[PDB]
Write a protein that binds this ligand. Sequence first.
Ligand SMILES: O=c1ccn([C@@H]2O[C@H](COP(=O)(O)OP(=O)(O)O)[C@@H](O)[C@H]2O)c(=O)[nH]1
Ligand SMILES: [Mn+2]
Length: 394
Amino acid sequence: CHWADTELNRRRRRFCSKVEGYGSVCSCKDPTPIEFSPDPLPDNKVLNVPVAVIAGNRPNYLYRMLRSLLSAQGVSPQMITVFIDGYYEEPMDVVALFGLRGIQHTPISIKNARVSQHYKASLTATFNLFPEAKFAVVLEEDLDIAVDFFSFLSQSIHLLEEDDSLYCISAWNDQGYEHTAEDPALLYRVETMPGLGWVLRRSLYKEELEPKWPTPEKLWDWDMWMRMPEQRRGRECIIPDVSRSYHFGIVGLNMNGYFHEAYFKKHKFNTVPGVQLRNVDSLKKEAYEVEVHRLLSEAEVLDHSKNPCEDSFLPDTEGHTYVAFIRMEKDDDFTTWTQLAKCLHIWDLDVRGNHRGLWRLFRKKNHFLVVGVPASPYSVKKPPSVTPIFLEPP
Ligand SMILES: O=c1ccn([C@@H]2O[C@H](COP(=O)(O)OP(=O)(O)O)[C@@H](O)[C@H]2O)c(=O)[nH]1
Ligand SMILES: [Mn+2]
C-alpha cells in the first residue's frame, strides 16, 4: 500500500508484510487505528504502577486484549510490559505493532508447572524493571479490560497500603453473573485470591512468595497454590460486585468450549465509564464488620419454609435487602452452599464468595445475604422462628 508516510504507518507496513489474518489493519484504504485516545484520569493514584501482561503463543487473543487495555481511561502505555512464554514470532510482532515493550522467556518444564515458572519469572522481572514500584497489576492475555479498569484501581489502591489484612485487589467477582450482579459502585471482601486482573504487593512477593515458589517438577497451578492457607493466611482480597474484566479465551490449558459456555459466558462485565466507588474506606477490616452488621439489621428475614431454588423464594420486589440462613456446622461445611449455587446457576465447583460464612449477591435486583449457621459469627442474628435451610446432593 501507499499509506501516508508516518511513523504509525511504517509500523503498519512491517507488520502487514509479515503476518495475515487481522483484517482491516492491512487494508489499503480503511486502515484501522493502531493508536488510541483514551480519556485522562484526573489525580491518578495508579499512574506509577507497572502492568505485567502474561502471554504465550496465542497471538490473536493478545491483539484482542491489548486493544481494550489501550482503550481504558488513565492507562500509561510506558508502564506496560508483555511477557511472552517463548520465542514465537507472531506474538512479538503484535507487541511491536502497538509499540510496547516485550520480554521473551525460554520455557521451563511442562503443562501447568510451566505456566507457574513463567509467572515467577515475569513477577521477578517486573519488580526489577521498576525498583521503586510497590505494586504491580497482573493481566492475562485472554481478558477484555473494562473501560474503567484503572479508575477502579485508582480509587481502591490505597486500601492495600493501609490494611495489612488484605491479600490483593481483583477485578473479578466469581459470583457476579448477569442475573446476580447489579451495582458497579459496590465492593466486597472475600476469603480467596480471584486473579483474572489483580494487584500484587511487592513486599508480599519479594518477602513471602518468591522464596517458596514451587520448583519446576511440581504439577501445581500457581493460583491454586496462592489460595492455600500457607500462602493466603487468612487474608482477604477486594472485589467489585460488577467485574472489570472478562475471560474470552476458549483455547487454553484447562479451557474448552463447554466449560466456557457453562461458567464464563454469562459473567457480567461493567461498561459504565468512570464509576465513583461508594464509601471505599468501609472495606477496611474493622469498618467492614460495621457495614455487615448494618446490612443485617436492615435485611428482611425470608420465609424458610419455601423452596430456595425458585424465584418465589423472594417477594416480587426491586431494591430491598433480604437474608437467608443455611446449615453450616463447621468452618468447612459448604454442602448446602454448593447445592444452592448449583440451582442458582452461578459458580459451584469450589467454594468462593464467602466472608466469615457470609455470601453477598443479587436476586431479581434485591440484595441477597446468605449466612452459615452455626459456623458464621453472624449466626447470632437468626431469629428463633428460622430453621436453617439444608440441601444435600443426590
Ligand atoms: O504454555 C503456556 C500456557 C499458558 N501461559 C499463560 O498462562 C495463562 C493461563 O492461560 P490459559 O488461559 O491457557 O489457562 P486456563 O485459564 O485456560 O486454564 C495465560 O495468560 C497464558 O499466557 C503461558 O505463559 N505458557
Ligand atoms: Mn485463560
